[PDB]
Design an enzyme around this catalytic site. Structure first.
Site, PDB file in Angstrom:
ATOM      1  N   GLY A 193       0.796  -1.230   0.000  1.00 53.93           N
ATOM      2  CA  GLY A 193       0.000   0.000   0.000  1.00 53.93           C
ATOM      3  C   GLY A 193       0.825   1.275   0.000  1.00 53.93           C
ATOM      4  O   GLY A 193       2.053   1.232   0.084  1.00 53.93           O
ATOM      5  N   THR A 194       0.140   2.414  -0.083  1.00 52.77           N
ATOM      6  CA  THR A 194       0.803   3.723  -0.131  1.00 52.77           C
ATOM      7  C   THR A 194       1.373   4.092   1.236  1.00 52.77           C
ATOM      8  O   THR A 194       1.003   3.505   2.250  1.00 52.77           O
ATOM      9  CB  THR A 194      -0.147   4.852  -0.598  1.00 52.77           C
ATOM     10  OG1 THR A 194      -1.196   5.038   0.358  1.00 52.77           O
ATOM     11  CG2 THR A 194      -0.752   4.537  -1.964  1.00 52.77           C
ATOM     12  N   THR A 195       2.274   5.069   1.252  1.00 50.45           N
ATOM     13  CA  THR A 195       2.948   5.472   2.483  1.00 50.45           C
ATOM     14  C   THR A 195       2.046   6.362   3.335  1.00 50.45           C
ATOM     15  O   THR A 195       1.397   7.272   2.823  1.00 50.45           O
ATOM     16  CB  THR A 195       4.266   6.217   2.185  1.00 50.45           C
ATOM     17  OG1 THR A 195       5.032   5.478   1.225  1.00 50.45           O
ATOM     18  CG2 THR A 195       5.093   6.399   3.460  1.00 50.45           C
TER      19      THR A 195
ATOM     20  N   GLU B  36       0.190   9.523   1.607  1.00 45.88           N
ATOM     21  CA  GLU B  36       0.443   9.605   0.171  1.00 45.88           C
ATOM     22  C   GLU B  36      -0.768   9.065  -0.587  1.00 45.88           C
ATOM     23  O   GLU B  36      -1.174   7.920  -0.375  1.00 45.88           O
ATOM     24  CB  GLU B  36       1.692   8.784  -0.175  1.00 45.88           C
ATOM     25  CG  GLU B  36       1.987   8.614  -1.661  1.00 45.88           C
ATOM     26  CD  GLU B  36       3.122   7.638  -1.923  1.00 45.88           C
ATOM     27  OE1 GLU B  36       4.036   7.985  -2.698  1.00 45.88           O
ATOM     28  OE2 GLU B  36       3.107   6.524  -1.355  1.00 45.88           O
TER      29      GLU B  36
ATOM     30  N   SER C  56      -2.456   2.124   5.808  1.00 46.56           N
ATOM     31  CA  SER C  56      -1.896   1.683   4.535  1.00 46.56           C
ATOM     32  C   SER C  56      -2.253   0.222   4.303  1.00 46.56           C
ATOM     33  O   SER C  56      -2.226  -0.577   5.235  1.00 46.56           O
ATOM     34  CB  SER C  56      -0.375   1.838   4.544  1.00 46.56           C
ATOM     35  OG  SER C  56      -0.002   3.195   4.705  1.00 46.56           O
TER      36      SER C  56
END
Ligand SMILES: [Cl-]
Ligand SMILES: [Mg+2]
Ligand SMILES: [Mg+2]
Ligand SMILES: [Mg+2]
Lengths: 250, 240, 111, 195, 231, 244, 241, 235, 243
Positions: free
Chosen positions: I29-31, I46, I74
């Site tokens: 997943g995204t940060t 993010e 995330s």
């Protein structure tokens, strides 16, 4: 969530064997030796206190347990399974008998109730069988003294004397030679200590052995006076000192 | 509760549990149904592997559902009791709510519906039973004969057989039974039913059971001697 | 003791013509001898060219109308925007009312 | 409903039940049969609150007919009466009890004896030579206490019944529109078409 | 492979294969396009038939006077989810006298689909949805995936060959967003967008399905000769 | 989920057999032989205890023969624990019938009820069946003396003489040979013991390896008496018939 | 081989899932120790904060179950907190129902019975933790009772748990072999804590700072944990003799 | 084993796809919709000559204005018919009117996917639901175990379906009369059936606005068969 | 083998492989990050711009619980939403009975126990998210991070997702260079920088910055989103640092 194991975990194999019961019996075989001997005026049950650590206080762990004032129990196999069975056995003696008839159940009927609980763990959904064999000694007015074995399957048999666990085969042979129908309680205790010494490796004394009897009524252990018909419990756990005294005359 | 889907489709579009239930019926003892002009006869096989049996008390193969309807079967014996009990309860429930006894077609439709329900319900297996349901509707003189099977399909038959070696006795009935002129009397109907079982049964002694159902709740089971007389007459004509 | 019913007064009147229909009602709302409102609408356009008024206990009247309006909405969803005929609406309203046979809507309804 | 009588003679049981059905100040029917055949040799008459009576009677009838089919065997009058009593004793502590009193007349083919059982709505069972429910017994019991013998014929039982009915018709304020009479014996159940 | 037998099982790389297979059912489904301006929001759907004797399967479903969606994948699953939206839109009106916000409608669909991806016995939904609506914050377009992911967009497309229409909208972004107070031109842009996903077949009178909602425009569906204008 | 570990106890084989029922019958075939013989004036129930010990308390022991009511008894073959669950159910059913109809339960009705319970475990619930086969010995005023058997399939049948458990094939042949319809109880007692003596896997048939019972009208006038034989009484009847 | 996935018997009469739960116990790589004084019961445990981003005050494997009972856990924190919450609920329910404070040994038995159920019922997994309960019981005095995933429990004179439990166990064994008594003959709890830390240092062979240790102390009518500064004072006294 | 509600890698429900294979094994059923009415016809397919063919009930009434033909595991259809009859009849109770054919079909199709681990498996039967209402006129629907239903001008289901559907492709036009449709069903049934078509092994039915749903007598069908033979021999 | 096919099964190691596989979904997943400041906390995330068609500032990822707690995560976004819905139920029942708003450590355990419960049975799947959350209560500021196993601790700074290593390194510098502490407005600026620096691991697609904060002085101990000028000021500071 929800318990979704509503199906049996113990089933018949092609050969007709109930695997989980056989495997439960194998667990009992690995367990520490315990035994029971019936006398004319009493019953004795005994086992080794196999301490897991010398730092552990083995007095706090009770392998021999009171179920009713006149009935006691000992086991071989998995200790935790035994502990919960004792809790249930104590409760079922009240709920299915004492609260109905105003008196404690006879040995054979309490055994029957315990046997039922163990059978249900062999057929009901999402459970394994209990990994213990019980030896239940007791007394009641109309049946006298009695000793019963209860296996993981739920089957139970009355015995004059027997042994279960690690060295049961050798111990049962030893008991066959010594047992007769004219034994007094003290003679049975003596034979129990002799039989148990053969299966024990290390220390053999009152602190490493657990032994109880079903014998005469103990009015000193009743806790009150004033009612003639109430004469006290027949179950008594022998002390460390009381065991050592009989080991000198061994 | 146990919810497991036991009866399910396979890649080729078959429900194996239902088809395996038919194999249990194939194993069961032979049962036959023949309807005449003014009667219906139900014949049943009794396997002679079991002697020392008490024939007084042994569960009979033909069961009365009501005073005017009967049910015979082939397959698992224990399974059949559950269907028969349900059918009997429904028959009384129908009389109780509608003030008329069930028609043979209605009772068949109920039993068949129970069988079907057990092919798409969770945690249950299909009944290993096919039934022959026969009788006469209230205030009617037209004979009725129906068949059911584990899948739940049912249909009406001029004559039909189920169970082991049913292929053979069905072959016999297909060439011997004439629709334009069915067995005019009780004798002719019973004779044809016994003849058909004699193709498969082995010995004509205590292996054949016969039950005659007539209009207006007139049901009777033949005895060993009465059946033995049919067995005698058939073979004596055959020696020619 | 708690009385779940009340009387909000009011009066309604429905007359049917040859090619038209009227549903009239006064706009007064009351309890006992007091006036609550001099203008509280009591007759409603429920959709599909149907007008409705539930007169008596206003809380029950508002609930019924609200439910019928909802019944019209779902009749469209379930039956391909079909127009709910007046006779079909009447039958639907019967079932709304009798669904509370043992704790009734204290209203006299006219559509 | 109003009056139901029963009398056990030598070789049969006779049940007499009123014909009238009443809703307030109007007699709805004057030819009502307040009885159900439970089995070929067992008959049950009944009386109590409207609806409950017939609902209970037909419920019992269905259960006994179910037993007969399942076992291909007729239950004894004693077994039937016990089953009925249990259903009423169960009913009395339910949310809405069946308000029904019954008489069960049957011929036991095993013992070759007629039997009459009286059971009220509480589940109070008693075996009797003769019995009644409601205000019926109050007028009839004195005549039955006087004239009854256990060795009476069916014809003598009917004559004693006519006397009981005549006394009811004289001293009861309510018009019950006569009685339907039924006899239960070894040959089954039949109705006396002229009474 | 070994980790695709049910929805309750992660793969060694952290994937949920049953959800991915449910996503695959959407790609097999017929193309549908969604786009909006500041005043209006439009759905355009290519309906699919079984054969020449058959009807063309309906793609667009109305949820309320101010909200509705188009489907791609298992139609019965869309009927279940659209029914749920109808009830939620209706709960908001009856209880709070409030028109359900399109963003909140997306959050409810996300949460409903999620429960089916974490529990044993059930299955994920096998359908993708494009929700349009007009609420107190103007026009809205949402994209629903049965993984649970819901996304607010200016425009999008789902179904077979949807990448062509999605690229077109990505170029046209600056143009069609400015189409305010002109429903016909916004539909034209939608019809031209869905045309980029066509091969062999073309837009006929019983093939095309259009829906619109806006400032003073209730959610209405156009089928049959009503869309002949845009062919 | 849990499906992975389900054995599916209630399904057909391709051949149309119930796996678990067949395997339960295989279990029962290793159990001690039980024999039932019906005579004109009574019924005999004989059964063999399995490899006992000298230290087993026999006089207070019961693994084969159980009492359901005053008129009906059963001989068990299979898992004793499973049998006791069913036995207690049957005892309750008999008492329910007696409370309802004020008459002792007909033998077949009791047998059907237990057999229906067994049947249920083969069709639904996902549980293993009861690994038990019963021989029912009983009396009622309809059919008189009756012998029945039931097995894990839930199917039951009536018999004049029957065996369950181990060596039933051999035992049934011996019974079929020497049995006659005009036979009496004393003769049936002798037949039962002789059959066990020839079919037994043990070296010799002794009193400590047997359980025995009779249902006789040999009670004072028109009534029935159940006799569960004591160890000493089994020892005497073994000498009388000339086996020991 | 599904007999290794759920809690049913293997042919050897073993429960592999229970055995593997015992192995999860050492996943944290932390060693704990418990000893009894005259008037008190002391429990110490290693504290390891590897990440600098962690708030060290929230990193703890010692729990205050009730006013009188304390519990240290050897095993992963999720299972540890699961057991902690349950024990707190059980201890509170006990007091409400039976009118007196739940004893340490009774709570241990209760939690052990719950663990036994997980070894018998298939749908529930065992918790991969070993629970050491400590108190000064009003009837039994200073008490140590320890529970494991098998459902086994027993009282202790002293005990140790973790990867290097054997080294600590033998060290304690040898001390009690000399003194020939079932406890640390010391008046103040401060000196009993000093004993505990000293014997862990000797057994493990490592020195400790104030942030390397975590200490719990049970006295009559209260159980409490020591702060870093309270431990520092304890470490100073050890070094000065 | 594997879940009952499992998706395949292609994005299809295994059990639904397998139930479609069972429907292919079923006896043929054909429906043709016209402006004068909708005709429904079926292959009876008796397994034996002793089976009384008139008891084979593969064409069924749901309401006066709605009929239904079935193909596949016909035992599974009984609960679907029961639900359909109840739905049609219940709507008449609530709304004092006939129920739309589409709404009825939608109600039946709502049952389809109510399976899991509700019923244990999908239905193994397809239905041709024919009827008439005031809004959309004469209609014919094909209800599958997937929960999907398509409207059709003409449709064939069962073992000879793809062969019959190709024939219906060429023969159907919007100006077909009822009589022409009757003969057309008989023609196509005769083409795909194993045994020779007659009044005993095949059954006709129709739904008209005036007379409602009617199953044809064997005498009436026999004449239509004889009329078919003569017109085919005419060229 | 086969120990990784079913949840709640211990491997011979004593590991729950299904939970470890859930961590892989988190790492995919995204940060997202969290920073503890002097009198509060700051959260940042993010958001990958998959397409131009995404409406800016509309697909909000950070969620509020009660009025004083912020949550970011995330991994599988729906799993996070499910966890927050539960958190909101837990917070509501706490306030209903005890009147006071739920303390952060109390709230942390409510989520922890719930997530842990989904590692006890094979009938459920573990959560495919690591959740960073916290806020201000009576005892001050608190920041927490919660893993799929149910494990959680308190943090000075926290990070998860694909760019967690880069983020963690940056957070470690702030802890060293600011022992006396960091202000709320500083933490917002630093949060923006760290997300921009962590974006090098997701450098293919461009992204959108989203920040929120709870602070005793700046927001009265309530959770608020960073908007308008203060957001642009943080973006400018972040863009200046990467160049
Ligand atoms: Cl407990
Ligand atoms: Mg057991
Ligand atoms: Mg009375
Ligand atoms: Mg477990």
């Amino acid at each position: 969530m929800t318990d979704r194991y509503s199906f049996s975990l113990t089933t018949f194999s092609p050969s007709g064997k109930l695997g989980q019961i056989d495997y439960a019996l194998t667990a009992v075989k690995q367990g520490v030796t315990s035994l029971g001997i019936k006398a004319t005026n009493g019953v004795v049950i005994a086992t080794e206190k196999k301490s897991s650590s010398p730092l552990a206080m083995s007095e706090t762990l009770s392998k021999v347990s009171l179920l009713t004032p006149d009935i006691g129990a000992v086991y071989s196999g998995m200790g935790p399974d035994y502990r919960v069975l004792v809790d249930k056995s104590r409760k079922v003696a009240h709920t299915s008998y004492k609260r109905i008839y105003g008196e404690y159940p006879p040995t054979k009927l309490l055994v029957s109730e315990v046997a039922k609980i163990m059978q249900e763990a062999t057929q009901s959904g999402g459970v394994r069988p209990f990994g213990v064999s019980l030896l239940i000694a007791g007394h009641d007015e109309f049946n006298g003294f009695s000793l019963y074995q209860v296996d993981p399957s739920g089957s139970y048999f009355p015995w004059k004397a027997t042994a279960i666990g690690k060295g049961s085969v050798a111990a049962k042979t030893f008991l066959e030679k010594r047992w007769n129908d004219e034994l007094e309680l003290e003679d049975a205790i003596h034979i129990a200590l002799l039989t148990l010494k053969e299966s024990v490796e290390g220390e053999f004394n009152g602190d490493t052995i657990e032994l109880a009897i079903i014998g005469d009524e103990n009015p000193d252990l009743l806790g009150y006076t004033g009612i003639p018909t109430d004469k006290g419990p027949r179950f008594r756990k022998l002390t460390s000192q009381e065991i050592n005294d009989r080991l000198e005359a061994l | 509760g146990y919810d497991r889907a036991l009866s399910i489709f396979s890649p080729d579009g078959h429900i194996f549990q239902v088809e395996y239930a038919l194999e249990a019926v194939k194993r069961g003892t032979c049962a036959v149904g023949v309807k005449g002009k003014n009667c219906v006869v139900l014949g049943c096989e009794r396997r002679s592997t079991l002697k020392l049996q008490d024939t007084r008390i042994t569960p009979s193969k033909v069961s009365k559902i009501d005073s005017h309807v009967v049910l015979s079967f082939s397959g698992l014996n224990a399974d059949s009791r559950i269907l028969i009990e349900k059918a009997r309860v429904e028959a009384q429930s129908h009389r109780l709510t509608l003030e008329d006894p069930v028609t043979v077609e209605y009772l068949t439709r109920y039993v068949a519906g129970v069988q079907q329900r057990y092919t798409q319900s969770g945690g249950v297996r299909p009944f290993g039973v096919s039934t022959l349901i026969a009788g006469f509707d209230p205030r009617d003189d037209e004979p009725k004969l129906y068949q059911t099977e584990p899948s739940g399909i049912y249909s009406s038959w001029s004559a039909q057989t189920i169970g082991r070696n049913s292929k053979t006795v069905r072959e016999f009935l297909e060439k011997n039974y004439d629709r334009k002129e069915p067995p005019a009397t009780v004798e002719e109907c019973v004779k044809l039913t016994v003849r058909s079982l004699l193709e498969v049964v082995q010995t004509g002694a205590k292996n054949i059971e016969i039950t005659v159902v007539k209009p207006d709740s007139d049901i009777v089971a033949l005895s060993s001697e009465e059946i033995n007389q049919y067995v005698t007459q058939i073979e004596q004509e055959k020696q020619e | 003791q708690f009385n779940p019913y009340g009387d909000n007064g009011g009066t309604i009147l429905g007359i049917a013509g040859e090619d038209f229909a009227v549903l009239a009602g006064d706009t007064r709302n009351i309890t006992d001898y007091s006036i609550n409102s001099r203008y509280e609408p009591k007759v409603f356009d429920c959709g599909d060219n149907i007008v409705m008024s539930a007169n008596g206990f206003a809380a029950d009247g508002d609930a019924l109308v609200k439910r019928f309006k909802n019944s019209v909405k779902w009749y469209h969803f379930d039956h391909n925007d079909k127009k709910l005929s007046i006779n079909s609406a009447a039958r639907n309203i019967q079932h709304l009312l009798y669904s509370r046979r043992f704790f009734p809507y204290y209203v006299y309804n006219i559509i | 409903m109003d009056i139901i009588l029963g009398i056990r003679v030598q070789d049969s049981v006779i049940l007499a039940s009123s014909k009238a059905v009443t809703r307030g100040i109007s007699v709805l029917k004057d030819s009502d049969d307040k009885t159900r055949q439970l089995s070929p040799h067992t008959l049950m008459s009944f009386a109590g609150e409207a609806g409950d009576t017939v609902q209970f009677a037909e419920y019992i009838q269905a259960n006994i007919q179910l037993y007969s089919i399942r076992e291909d065997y007729e239950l004894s009058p004693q077994a039937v009466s016990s089953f009925v009593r249990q259903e009423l004793a169960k009913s009395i502590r339910s949310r809405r009890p069946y308000q029904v009193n019954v008489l069960i007349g049957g011929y036991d083919k095993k013992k070759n004896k007629p039997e009459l059982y009286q059971i009220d709505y509480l589940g109070t069972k008693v075996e009797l030579p003769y019995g009644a429910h409601g205000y019926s017994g109050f007028y009839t019991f004195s005549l039955l206490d006087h004239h009854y013998r256990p060795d009476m014929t069916t014809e003598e039982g009917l004559d004693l019944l006519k006397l009981c009915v005549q006394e009811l018709e004289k001293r009861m304020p309510m018009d019950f529109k006569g009685v339907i009479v039924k006899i239960v014996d070894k040959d089954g159940i039949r109705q006396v078409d002229d009474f | 492979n070994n980790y695709d037998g049910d929805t309750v099982t992660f793969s060694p790389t952290g994937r949920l294969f049953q959800v991915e297979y449910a996503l695959e059912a959407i790609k097999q489904g017929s193309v549908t396009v969604g786009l909006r301006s500041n005043t209006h929001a439009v759905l355009v759907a290519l309906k699919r038939n079984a054969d020449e004797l058959s009807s063309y399967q309906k793609k667009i479903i109305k949820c309320d006077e101010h909200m509705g969606l188009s489907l791609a994948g298992l139609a019965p699953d869309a009927r279940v989810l659209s029914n749920y939206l109808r009830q939620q839109c209706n709960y908001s009106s009856l209880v709070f006298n409030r028109k359900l916000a399109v963003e909140r409608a997306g959050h409810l669909l996300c949460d409903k689909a999620q429960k089916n991806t974490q529990s044993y016995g059930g299955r994920p939904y096998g359908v993708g949805l494009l929700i349009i609506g007009y609420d107190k914050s103007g026009a809205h377009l949402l994209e629903f995936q049965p993984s649970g992911n819901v996304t607010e967009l200016y425009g999008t497309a789902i179904g077979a060959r949807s990448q062509g229409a999605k690229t077109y909208l990505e170029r046209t972004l600056d143009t069609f967003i400015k189409i305010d107070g002109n429903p016909d031109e916004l539909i034209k842009a939608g019809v031209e967008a869905i045309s980029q996903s066509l091969r062999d077949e073309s837009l006929t009178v019983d093939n095309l399905s259009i829906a619109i909602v806006g400032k003073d425009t209730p959610f209405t569906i156009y089928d049959g000769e009503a869309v002949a204008k845009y062919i | 989920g849990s499906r992975r570990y389900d054995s599916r106890t209630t399904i057909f084989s391709p051949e149309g057999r119930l796996y678990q029922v067949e395997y339960a019958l295989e279990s029962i075939s290793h159990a001690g032989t039980a024999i039932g013989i019906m005579a004109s004036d009574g019924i005999v129930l004989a059964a063999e205890r399995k490899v006992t010990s000298t230290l087993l308390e026999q006089d207070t022991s019961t693994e084969k023969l159980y009492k359901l009511n005053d008129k009906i008894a059963v001989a068990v073959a299979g898992l004793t624990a499973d049998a006791e669950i069913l036995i207690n159910t049957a005892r309750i059913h008999a008492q329910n019938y007696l409370k309802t109809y004020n008459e002792d339960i007909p033998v077949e009705i009791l047998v059907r009820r237990l057999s229906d319970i067994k049947q249920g475990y083969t069709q639904h619930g996902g549980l293993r069946p009861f690994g038990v086969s019963f021989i029912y010995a009983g009396y009622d005023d309809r059919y008189g003396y009756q012998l029945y058997t039931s097995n894990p399939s839930g199917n039951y049948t009536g018999w004049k003489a029957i065996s369950v458990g181990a060596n039933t094939s051999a035992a049934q042949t011996l019974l079929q040979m020497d049995y006659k319809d005009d036979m009496k109880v004393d003769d049936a007692i002798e037949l039962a013991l002789k059959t066990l003596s020839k079919t037994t896997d043990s070296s010799a048939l002794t009193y400590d390896r047997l359980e025995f019972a009779t249902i006789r009208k040999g009670a004072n006038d028109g009534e029935v008496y159940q006799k569960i034989f004591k160890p000493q009484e089994i020892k005497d009847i073994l000498v009388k018939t000339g086996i020991t | 081989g599904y007999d290794r996935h759920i809690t049913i018997f293997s042919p050897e009469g073993r429960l592999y899932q229970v055995e593997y739960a015992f192995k999860a116990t050492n996943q944290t790589n932390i060693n704990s120790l418990a000893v009894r004084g005259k008037d008190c019961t002391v429990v110490i445990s290693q504290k390891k904060v590897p990440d600098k981003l962690l708030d060290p005050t929230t990193v703890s494997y010692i729990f205050c179950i009730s006013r009188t009972i304390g519990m240290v856990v050897n095993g992963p924190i999720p299972d540890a907190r699961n057991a902690a919450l349950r024990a707190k609920a059980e201890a509170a329910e006990f007091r409400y129902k039976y009118g007196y404070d739940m004893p340490c040994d009774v709570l241990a038995k209760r939690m052990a019975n719950l663990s036994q159920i997980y070894t018998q019922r298939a749908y529930m997994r065992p918790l991969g933790v070993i629970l050491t309960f400590v108190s000064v019981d009003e009837e039994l005095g200073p008490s140590i009772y320890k529970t494991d995933p098998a459902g086994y429990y027993v009282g202790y004179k002293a005990t140790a748990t973790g990867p290097k439990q054997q080294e600590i166990t033998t060290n304690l064994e040898n001390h009690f072999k000399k003194s020939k008594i079932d406890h640390i003959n010391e008046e103040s709890w401060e000196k009993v804590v000093e004993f505990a830390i000293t014997h862990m240092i000797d057994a493990l062979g490592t020195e400790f700072s104030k942030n390397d240790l975590e200490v719990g102390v049970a006295t009559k009518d209260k159980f409490f944990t020591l702060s870093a500064e309270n431990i520092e004072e304890r470490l100073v006294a050890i070094a000065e003799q | 084993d594997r879940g009952v509600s499992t998706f395949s890698p292609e994005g299809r429900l295994f059990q639904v796809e397998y139930s479609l294979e069972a429907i292919k094994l079923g006896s043929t059923a054909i429906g043709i919709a016209t402006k004068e009415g909708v005709v429904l016809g079926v292959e009876k397919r008796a397994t034996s000559p002793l089976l009384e063919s008139d008891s084979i009930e593969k064409i069924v009434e749901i309401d006066r204005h709605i009929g239904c033909a079935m193909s596949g595991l016909t035992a599974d259809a009984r609960s679907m018919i029961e639900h359909a009859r109840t739905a049609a009849v219940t709507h008449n109770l609530y709304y004092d009117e006939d129920i739309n054919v589409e709404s009825l079909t939608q109600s039946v199709c709502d049952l389809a996917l109510r399976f899991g681990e509700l019923m244990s498996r999908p239905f193994g039967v397809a239905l041709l639901i024919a009827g008439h209402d005031a809004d959309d006129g004469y209609q014919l629907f094909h209800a599958e175990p997937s929960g999907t239903f398509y409207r059709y001008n003409a449709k064939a289901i069962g073992s000879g379906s793809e062969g019959a559907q190709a024939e219906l492709l060429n023969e159907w036009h919007s100006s077909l009369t009822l009589k022409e449709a009757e003969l057309l069903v008989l023609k196509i049934l005769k083409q795909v059936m194993e045994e020779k078509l007659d009044e005993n092994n095949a059954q006709l039915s129709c739904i008209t606005k005036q007379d409602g749903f009617k199953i044809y007598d064997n005498e009436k069908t026999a004449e239509l068969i004889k009329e078919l033979k003569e017109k085919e021999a005419a060229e | 083998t086969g120990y990784d096919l079913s949840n709640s099964v211990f491997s011979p190691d004593g590991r729950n492989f299904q939970v470890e596989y859930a961590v892989k979904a988190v790492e995919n997943g995204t940060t997202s990050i969290g920073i503890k400041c002097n009198d509060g906390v700051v959260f940042a995330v993010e958001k990958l711009i998959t397409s131009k068609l995404l409406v800016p500032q509309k697909n909000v990822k950070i969620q509020v619980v009660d009025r004083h707690i912020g949550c970011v995560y995330s991994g599988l976004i729906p799993d996070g939403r499910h966890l927050v819905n539960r958190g909101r139920e837990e917070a509501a029942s706490f306030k209903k009975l005890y009147k006071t708003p739920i303390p952060i450590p109390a709230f942390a355990d409510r989520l922890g126990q719930y997530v842990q419960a989904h590692t006890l049975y094979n009938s459920v799947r573990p959560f495919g998210v690591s959740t960073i959350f916290g806020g201000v209560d009576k005892n001050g500021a608190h920041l927490y991070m919660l893993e799929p196993s149910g494990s959680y601790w308190g943090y000075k700074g926290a990070a998860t997702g694909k760019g967690r290593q880069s983020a963690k390194a940056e957070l470690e510098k702030l802890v060293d260079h600011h022992p006396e502490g960091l202000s709320a407005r500083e933490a917002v600026k630093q949060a923006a920088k760290i997300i921009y620096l962590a974006h090098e691991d997701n450098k293919e697609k461009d992204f959108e910055l989203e920040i929120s904060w709870c602070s005793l002085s700046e927001t009265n101990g309530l959770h608020k989103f960073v908007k308008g000028d203060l957001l642009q000021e943080a973006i400018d500071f972040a863009q200046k640092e990467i160049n």
